[PDB]
Amino acid sequence: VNDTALLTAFKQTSIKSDPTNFLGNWDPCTWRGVSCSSDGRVIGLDLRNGGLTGTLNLNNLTALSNLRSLYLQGNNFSSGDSSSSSGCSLEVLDLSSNSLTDSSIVDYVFSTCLNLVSVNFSHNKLAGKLKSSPSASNKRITTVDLSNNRFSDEIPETFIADFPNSLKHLDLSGNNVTGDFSRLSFGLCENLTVFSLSQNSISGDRFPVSLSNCKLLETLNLSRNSLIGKIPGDDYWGNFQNLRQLSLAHNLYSGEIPPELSLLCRTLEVLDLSGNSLTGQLPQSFTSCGSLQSLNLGNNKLSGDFLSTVVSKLSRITNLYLPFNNISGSVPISLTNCSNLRVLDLSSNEFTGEVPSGFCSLQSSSVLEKLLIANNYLSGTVPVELGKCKSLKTIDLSFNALTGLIPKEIWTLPKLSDLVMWANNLTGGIPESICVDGGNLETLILNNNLLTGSLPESISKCTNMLWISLSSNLLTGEIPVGIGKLEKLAILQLGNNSLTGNIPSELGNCKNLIWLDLNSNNLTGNLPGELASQAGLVMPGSVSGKQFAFVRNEGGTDCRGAGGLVEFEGIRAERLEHFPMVHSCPKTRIYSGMTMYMFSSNGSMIYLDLSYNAVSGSIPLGYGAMGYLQVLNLGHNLLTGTIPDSFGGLKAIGVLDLSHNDLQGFLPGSLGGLSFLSDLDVSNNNLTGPIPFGGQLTTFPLTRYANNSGLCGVPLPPCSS
Numbered sequence: 001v002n003d004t005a006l007l008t009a010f011k012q013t014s015i016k017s018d019p020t021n022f023l024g025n026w027d028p029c030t031w032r033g034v035s036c037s038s039d040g041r042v043i044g045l046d047l048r049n050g051g052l053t054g055t056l057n058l059n060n061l062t063a064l065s066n067l068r069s070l071y072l073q074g075n076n077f078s079s080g081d082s083s084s085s086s087g088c089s090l091e092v093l094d095l096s097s098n099s100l101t102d103s104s105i106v107d108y109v110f111s112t113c114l115n116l117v118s119v120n121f122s123h124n125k126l127a128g129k130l131k132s133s134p135s136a137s138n139k140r141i142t143t144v145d146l147s148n149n150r151f152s153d154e155i156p157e158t159f160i161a162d163f164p165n166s167l168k169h170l171d172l173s174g175n176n177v178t179g180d181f182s183r184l185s186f187g188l189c190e191n192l193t194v195f196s197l198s199q200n201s202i203s204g205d206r207f208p209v210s211l212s213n214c215k216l217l218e219t220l221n222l223s224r225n226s227l228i229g230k231i232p233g234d235d236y237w238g239n240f241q242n243l244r245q246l247s248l249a250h251n252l253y254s255g256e257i258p259p260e261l262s263l264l265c266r267t268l269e270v271l272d273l274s275g276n277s278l279t280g281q282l283p284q285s286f287t288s289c290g291s292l293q294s295l296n297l298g299n300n301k302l303s304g305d306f307l308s309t310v311v312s313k314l315s316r317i318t319n320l321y322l323p324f325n326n327i328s329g330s331v332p333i334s335l336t337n338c339s340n341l342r343v344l345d346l347s348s349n350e351f352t353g354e355v356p357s358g359f360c361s362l363q364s365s366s367v368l369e370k371l372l373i374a375n376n377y378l379s380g381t382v383p384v385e386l387g388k389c390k391s392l393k394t395i396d397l398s399f400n401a402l403t404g405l406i407p408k409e410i411w412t413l414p415k416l417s418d419l420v421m422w423a424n425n426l427t428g429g430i431p432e433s434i435c436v437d438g439g440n441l442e443t444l445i446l447n448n449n450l451l452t453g454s455l456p457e458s459i460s461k462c463t464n465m466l467w468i469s470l471s472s473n474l475l476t477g478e479i480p481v482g483i484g485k486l487e488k489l490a491i492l493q494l495g496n497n498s499l500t501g502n503i504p505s506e507l508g509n510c511k512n513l514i515w516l517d518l519n520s521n522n523l524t525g526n527l528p529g530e531l532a533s534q535a536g537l538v539m540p541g542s543v544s545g546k547q548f549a550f551v552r553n554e555g556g557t558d559c560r561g562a563g564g565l566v567e568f569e570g571i572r573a574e575r576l577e578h579f580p581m582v583h584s585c586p587k588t589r590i591y592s593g594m595t596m597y598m599f600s601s602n603g604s605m606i607y608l609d610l611s612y613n614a615v616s617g618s619i620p621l622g623y624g625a626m627g628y629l630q631v632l633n634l635g636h637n638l639l640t641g642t643i644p645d646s647f648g649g650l651k652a653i654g655v656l657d658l659s660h661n662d663l664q665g666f667l668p669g670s671l672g673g674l675s676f677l678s679d680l681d682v683s684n685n686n687l688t689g690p691i692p693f694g695g696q697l698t699t700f701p702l703t704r705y706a707n708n709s710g711l712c713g714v715p716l717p718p719c720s721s
C-alpha cells in the first residue's frame with residue numbers, strides 16, 4: 001500500500017466533485033495540498049476551502065504511515081463507511097466546515113491517534129450523545145473543539161474529567177446537550193485555560209465543586225443556557241486568579257451583581273452578564289478592574305448612577321453595553337473619563353436630558369466609533385459637539401424627543417456610516433454635500449420626522465448605501481434620478497410624503513434593490529418596466545443581519561400601505577406597540593427579527609408598495625417575473641389595461657393589491673397557481689368574467705371583488721346563471 005496509491009484511492013473513492021480543479025495534477029510530493037517530507041513520505045494534506053464534495057472515511061487516509069496533519073476544513077465532506085482498520089499518527093486534525101454526521105469518527109480519533117495535539121470537529125452535523133473521552137494513553141492532546149454540532153441529551157458525569165491532564169482548550173458550544181450542571185465533574189482540571197458550554201440547555205442552581213480546581217482558567221463561557229439562581233459570590237471567584245473572560249449571559253440569573261465577583265479584577269478583561277434578570281447596580285468593588293475592556297450588562301433590570309460612581313473609574317473601558325435596563329436620569333458626564341471608549345450602548349433606558357457629547361472634547365482625539373441611545377427620553381437638539389468625534393461610524397438617536405435641525409457637522413463626519421435618528425421631531429433638510437465631504441453612508445434612516453425639502457441628487461455619491469428610510473416626513477419635490485448609481489442599495493422607503501414627478505427609470509440599475517416603498521405620495525407618470533429588469537440577478541448584500549420590525553396593517557386596502565418596516569436596533573417592542581403610527585390601522589401585528597435573505601443568488605425584488613399615488617398607464621408585463629416578490633401593492637392609482645397573465649409567476653407572493661384603478665378584462669387563471677396568496681384585493685375596477693377557481697381565490701371575502709364590471713363565480717353568484 002504505497003502512499004501515492006492511497007491518496008489516489010482517496011480522490012476517487014471519497015471525492016465526488018472538484019469544481020475548483022484544485023485537486024488536479026494528482027510523485028506524491030508534487031500533488032496540490034500534500035506537504036511531503038525529505039525521505040519521500042507524506043506527512044500532511046492541506047485541502048482547506050477547496051469546495052470539495054464527497055464521503056469521508058478517515059481510515060482510508062490514516063493508512064498513510066507518516067501522516068500527521070490533515071486539513072479538510074471548508075469543504076462539503078459527508079460521513080463515510082467504516083471501511084478498514086488502520087493505525088493513526090495524526091497530530092493535528094481539522095474538519096471544521098463539512099457535513100459530517102457520524103460521530104464514530106470522534107471515537108476513532110479519541111481511541112487511536114495517541115499523538116493527537118489538536119482536533120477541530122466544529123461546524124458539522126455530528127449527532128448523538130457524548131460518550132467517550134480521549135484515550136488515557138494519549139499524553140499530548142491539548143485543544144479539542146466539538147462546537148457547533150447537534151450533540152444531544154445528558155453529558156456524562158466524568159466526560160470532562162476523563163480527558164488527559166494536558167487539556168488546555170475545550171469548546172462544547174453550539175449543541176443541545178442537557179443536564180444539571182452541578183453533577184458534572186471536571187476532575188483535577190489541571191492546565192485547563194479555555195472552557196465553553198455556551199448555547200446549550202444546561203440547568204442547575206449550583207456550579208460543580210470540581211470547577212474550582214481549574215486554577216488556570218482564562219476563559220469561562222456559559223452563555224445561552226438555563227442556569228438559575230443567584231450568581232456565586234463569597235470566596236468562589238478567588239479560585240480563578242487567571243480568569244480574563246467570563247460569560248454568564250442569557251441564563252436565568254436573578255438578584256444583584258455580587259460584589260465578590262470583583263475578585264477577578266486583577267485579570268478580568270471581558271465580562272458579559274447580559275440577558276438575565278439582574279437588579280440593583282454594578283457594585284462599587286469593581287473600581288479595581290483596571291484591566292476590564294468589554295463590559296456588557298444589557299437586557300437586565302439594573303438602575304442607579306453606577307455609570308458615574310463606578311464605570312467612569314474604569315480607565316481601560318473600550319466597549320460598554322448597557323441597553324435595555326432601567327437607568328434613569330441624565331447620562332453622566334463623568335463617563336468621558338473613559339479615555340479609550342470606542343462603543344457606548346445605552347439604548348432602551350429611562351435616560352433624560354440632552355445628548356451626551358463630552359467624549360469628543362477630550363484633551364486627546366476621541367476614539368468613539370459607535371454611540372447608541374435609542375428608545376430614551378432625550379430632548380433638545382443634536383449637539384454640534386459630536387462633529388469633533390472624527391472616528392464616529394454609527395449614530396443611533398432614534399425614538400427620543402429630539403427636535404430642531406440636524407447640524408451640518410453631522411453630515412461632514414469623515415467616517416460616519418450609519419445615521420439612524422428616526423422617530424423624532426427633527427426638522428430641516430438634507431444637505432447637497434452628503435457623502436462627498438462627509439462619510440459614504442451605509443444607512444440613512446430618518447423616517448417619522450418633520451424633515452422638509454427634496455432629496456438631493458448628491459445622494460448619488462453614497463455608493464455604499466444599503467438602506468434609506470425617509471417615510472412619513474414632509475418631503476417634497478421629485479425622486480432624484482441619481483439613485484440609480486446606488487448598486488448596493490437594498491431598501492428604499494419614501495412613503496407618506498408629498499413626492500411629485502415620475503418614478504425614475506434609473507431605479508432599474510439598483511442591482512441589489514429588494515424593498516421599494518413609495519406609498520401615499522403624489523407621483524404620476526407610467527409604471528417603469530425597468531423595476532423588474534434585475535429579476536433573477538439580485539445578489540444579497542451587507543444589509544443582511546440587521547434588526548428590523550414589521551408592523552402589518554391588517555385592515556385591508558382602507559389602511560394606507562401594506563405595512564411598516566422599521567430599523568429596530570435598541571428599541572423595545574412595547575415602545576412600538578404604543579407608537580400612534582401603529583394605531584393608524586385598527587388591526588395590527590408586530591413581526592420582528594433580523595434581516596435575512598431567502599436566496600443566495602439570482603434573486604428578485606421582495607417588497608413593492610406603490611399604492612396611493614396617481615400613476616397611469618398599463619402594468620408592465622415584466623413585473624410578473626419576480627419570483628421572490630412577496631408583496632405587490634399597486635392599489636389606489638389610475639392604472640389601466642389588464643392584469644398580465646405573467647402574474648402567475650409571482651410564486652412567493654402573499655399579498656396582491658390592485659384595487660381602486662381602471663384595470664379592465666379578466667382575472668388571470670394562473671392566480672390560482674399561487675400557493676401562498678393569502679391577501680388579494682381587486683375591488684373597485686372595471687374587471688369582468690369568472691373568478692379563477694384554483695388556489696385560494698374562491699375563499700376571499702366578498703369585499704375583495706366588489707364594485708367591478710361583471711365579475712361572476714364563487715364567492716360571487718355563479719357565472720352560468
Ligand SMILES: *[C@@H]1O[C@H](CO)[C@@H](O[C@@H]2O[C@H](CO)[C@@H](O[C@@H]3O[C@H](CO[C@H]4O[C@H](CO[C@H]5O[C@H](CO)[C@@H](O)[C@H](O)[C@@H]5O[C@H]5O[C@H](CO)[C@@H](O)[C@H](O)[C@@H]5O)[C@@H](O)[C@H](O[C@H]5O[C@H](CO)[C@@H](O)[C@H](O)[C@@H]5O[C@H]5O[C@H](CO)[C@@H](O)[C@H](O)[C@@H]5O)[C@@H]4O)[C@@H](O)[C@H](O[C@H]4O[C@H](CO)[C@@H](O)[C@H](O)[C@@H]4O[C@H]4O[C@H](CO)[C@@H](O)[C@H](O)[C@@H]4O)[C@@H]3O)[C@H](O)[C@H]2NC(C)=O)[C@H](O)[C@H]1NC(C)=O
Nearest residue numbers: 173198199221223245246247249270272274296593594596
Ligand atoms: C461565548 O460564546 C458565545 C457563543 O456561544 C459567543 O457569542 C458569539 O459572539 C460573537 C462575537 O463576534 C457573535 O458574532 C457576532 O454577532 C453579531 C450579531 O450579534 C447579535 O446577534 C447574534 C445572533 O442572535 C440570534 O441568535 C441568537 C442565538 O443564536 C438568538 O438568541 C437571537 O434571538 C438571534 O436570533 C434571531 O436571529 C436568528 C438569525 O436570523 C434567527 O434564527 C432567530 O430566529 C432570530 O430571528 C447574537 O449572538 C449576539 O449576541 C451577542 O451580543 C449581545 C449584545 O451585545 C449579547 O447579549 C450576547 O451575549 C452576545 O455577546 C457577544 O457580542 C457582544 C457584542 O455584540 C460582546 O459584548 C460579548 O462579549 C459577546 O461576544 C447579538 O444579539 C454580528 O454583528 C457579527 O457579525 C460580524 O462578524 C462576522 C464574522 O464573525 C461577519 O461575517 C459579519 O459580517 C459581521 O462583521 C462586521 O464586523 C466585523 C468586525 O467585527 C467587520 O470585519 C465586518 O466588516 C462587519 O462590520 C458576529 O457574527 C455571535 O453572534 C455570538 N453568538 C451567540 C450565540 O451569542 C461569545 O462571544 C462568547 N463570549 C466570550 C466572552 O468569549
Ligand SMILES: CC(C)[C@H](C)[C@@H](O)[C@H](O)[C@@H](C)[C@H]1CC[C@H]2[C@@H]3CC[C@@H]4C[C@H](O)[C@H](O)C[C@]4(C)[C@H]3CC[C@]12C
Nearest residue numbers: 515548550552591594595596597606630654655678
Ligand atoms: C428587507 C428584508 C431582507 C426583510 C428584513 C426580510 O428578511 C423579512 O423576512 C420579510 C420579507 C418578512 C418579515 C415579515 C413578513 C410579513 C408578515 C406579515 C404578512 C403576512 C402575510 O401572510 C403575507 O406573508 C404578507 C406579510 C406582509 C409578510 C411579508 C414578508 C415579511 C415582510
Ligand SMILES: *[C@@H]1O[C@H](CO)[C@@H](O[C@@H]2O[C@H](CO)[C@@H](O)[C@H](O)[C@H]2NC(C)=O)[C@H](O)[C@H]1NC(C)=O
Nearest residue numbers: 016017051052053054055075076077078079099
Ligand atoms: C454537498 O454535498 C451534498 C451531498 O452530500 C449535496 O446535497 C445534495 O445536492 C443535490 C444537488 O446537487 C440535491 O439534489 C440533493 O438532494 C442533496 N442531498 C442532500 C442529502 O442534501 C449538496 O448540494 C452539496 N453542497 C454543495 C456542493 O454546496
Ligand SMILES: *[C@@H]1O[C@H](CO)[C@@H](O[C@@H]2O[C@H](CO)[C@@H](O)[C@H](O)[C@H]2NC(C)=O)[C@H](O)[C@H]1NC(C)=O
Nearest residue numbers: 300301303324325326327348349350572573574
Ligand atoms: C424597567 O423598565 C421596564 C421596561 O420599560 C418596565 O417594564 C414594563 O413595565 C410596564 C408597566 O406598566 C409594562 O406595561 C410593560 O409591559 C413592561 N415591559 C416589559 C418589557 O416588561 C419595568 O416596569 C421597569 N421597572 C421599574 C422598577 O420601573
Ligand SMILES: *[C@@H]1O[C@H](CO)[C@@H](O[C@@H]2O[C@H](CO)[C@@H](O)[C@H](O)[C@H]2NC(C)=O)[C@H](O)[C@H]1NC(C)=O
Nearest residue numbers: 471472473496497520559560561580581583584
Ligand atoms: C403620515 O405621517 C403623518 C405625520 O404627521 C401622520 O399624521 C398624523 O396623523 C395622526 C392620525 O391619528 C394624528 O394623530 C397625528 O397628530 C398626525 N401627526 C401630525 C404631526 O400631523 C399621518 O397619519 C401619516 N399617514 C400615514 C398614512 O401613515
Ligand SMILES: *[C@@H]1O[C@H](CO)[C@@H](O[C@@H]2O[C@H](CO)[C@@H](O)[C@H](O)[C@H]2NC(C)=O)[C@H](O)[C@H]1NC(C)=O
Nearest residue numbers: 476477497498499500520521522523612613614
Ligand atoms: C397630494 O395628494 C394628497 C392626497 O390626495 C392631496 O391632499 C388631498 O387633496 C384633496 C383634494 O380634494 C383633499 O380633499 C384632501 O383632504 C387632501 N388630503 C388628503 C389626506 O387626501 C394633496 O393636495 C396633494 N399634493 C400635491 C402637492 O399635489
Ligand SMILES: *[C@@H]1O[C@H](CO)[C@@H](O[C@@H]2O[C@H](CO)[C@@H](O)[C@H](O)[C@H]2NC(C)=O)[C@H](O)[C@H]1NC(C)=O
Nearest residue numbers: 511534535536537538539600601602603604627
Ligand atoms: C444568475 O446570475 C448569473 C450571474 O449574473 C447569470 O450568469 C452570468 O451572468 C453574467 C452577467 O451577470 C454573464 O456575463 C454570464 O455570461 C452569465 N453566465 C451564464 C448565463 O452562464 C445567470 O444567467 C443567472 N441565472 C438565471 C437568471 O437563471
Ligand SMILES: *[C@@H]1O[C@H](CO)[C@@H](O[C@@H]2O[C@H](CO)[C@@H](O)[C@H](O)[C@H]2NC(C)=O)[C@H](O)[C@H]1NC(C)=O
Nearest residue numbers: 557558659660683684702703704705706707708
Ligand atoms: C363600492 O362603492 C360604493 C360606492 O362608492 C362604496 O360605498 C361608499 O362607501 C363610502 C365609505 O364608506 C361612503 O362614504 C359612501 O357614501 C358610500 N357610497 C354609497 C353610494 O353608499 C363601497 O364601500 C364600495 N365597496 C368596496 C368594497 O370598496
Ligand SMILES: *[C@@H]1O[C@H](CO)[C@@H](O)[C@H](O)[C@H]1NC(C)=O
Nearest residue numbers: 013014055056057060080083
Ligand atoms: C476505503 O477503502 C475501502 C477498501 O477498498 C473501500 O471499501 C471504501 O469504500 C473506502 N472508503 C472511502 C470513503 O472511500
Ligand SMILES: *[C@@H]1O[C@H](CO)[C@@H](O)[C@H](O)[C@H]1NC(C)=O
Nearest residue numbers: 139140142165166167190191
Ligand atoms: C499539566 O499539568 C501538570 C500538573 O501541573 C503538569 O505536570 C504537566 O506538565 C501539564 N501539562 C502541560 C502540557 O502543560
Ligand SMILES: *[C@@H]1O[C@H](CO)[C@@H](O)[C@H](O)[C@H]1NC(C)=O
Nearest residue numbers: 153175176177178179200201
Ligand atoms: C433541546 O433540548 C431541550 C431540553 O431537552 C428540548 O426541550 C428542546 O426541544 C431541544 N431542542 C431541539 C431542537 O431538539
Ligand SMILES: *[C@@H]1O[C@H](CO)[C@@H](O)[C@H](O)[C@H]1NC(C)=O
Nearest residue numbers: 399400401423424425448449
Ligand atoms: C413630537 O412631539 C410630540 C409633542 O407632543 C410628541 O408627542 C411626539 O411623540 C414627538 N414625535 C416623535 C416621533 O417622537
